[PDB]
Amino acid sequence: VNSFSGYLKLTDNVYIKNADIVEEAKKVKPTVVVNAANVYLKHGGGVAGALNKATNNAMQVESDDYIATNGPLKVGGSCVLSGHNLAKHCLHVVGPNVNKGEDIQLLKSAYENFNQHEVLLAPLLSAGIFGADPIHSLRVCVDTVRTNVYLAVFDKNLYDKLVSSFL
Numbered sequence: 826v827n828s829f830s831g832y833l834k835l836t837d838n839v840y841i842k843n844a845d846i847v848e849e850a851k852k853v854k855p856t857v858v859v860n861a862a863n864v865y866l867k868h869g870g871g872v873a874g875a876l877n878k879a880t881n882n883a884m885q886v887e888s889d890d891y892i893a894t895n896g897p898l899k900v901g902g903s904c905v906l907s908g909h910n911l912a913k914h915c916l917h918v919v920g921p922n923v924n925k926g927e928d929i930q931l932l933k934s935a936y937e938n939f940n941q942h943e944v945l946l947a948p949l950l951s952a953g954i955f956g957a958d959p960i961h962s963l964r965v966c967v968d969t970v971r972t973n974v975y976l977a978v979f980d981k982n983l984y985d986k987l988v989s990s991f992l
């Protein structure tokens with residue numbers, strides 16, 4: 826038993842809620858929140874911009890030190906950094922950005938990072954401003970992630986479509 830409230834159960838291990846991931850993290854303070862990162866950990870917009878703004882830019886300061894030391898992530902890759910005021914840890918995951926020509930086949934690799942953590946609060950990877958079909962992203966999530974994932978979907982209209990079309 827955990828702190829997540831009001832999620833709809835999709836599968837044995839996947840749960841979903843219409844919620845702003847920024848607000849959900851501040852309330853729950855989960856062990857792991859997933860960020861929809863890019864390879865530079867430049868948290869300008871989307872989920873990453875919103876999470877970073879909620880940390881008062883501390884997430885960006887930590888991220889720039891990480892890149893200065895380690896270089897960019899891979900598309901499909903991840904790193905674990907502080908969760909600041911939002912979570913114990915932030916798992917920064919790079920889904921493919923369709924708008925940049927990145928291979929959508931890398932979405933499954935991206936979601937495999939989630940399997941290194943027992944429970945996560947997460948957005949749909951490659952959704953929103955990363956340009957992928959969210960219905961596809963939820964299908965890959967369900968077919969790839971075996972640990973317990975609590976999905977926050979910001980858009981109420983998209984949430985309803987995701988639930989109503991879910992096989």
Ligand SMILES: NS(=O)(=O)c1nc2ccccc2[nH]1
Nearest residue numbers: 845846847871872875953979
């Ligand atoms: N209401 S917000 O914190 O400014 C915000 N922006 C967001 C973009 C993508 C996903 C969740 C978001 N939340």
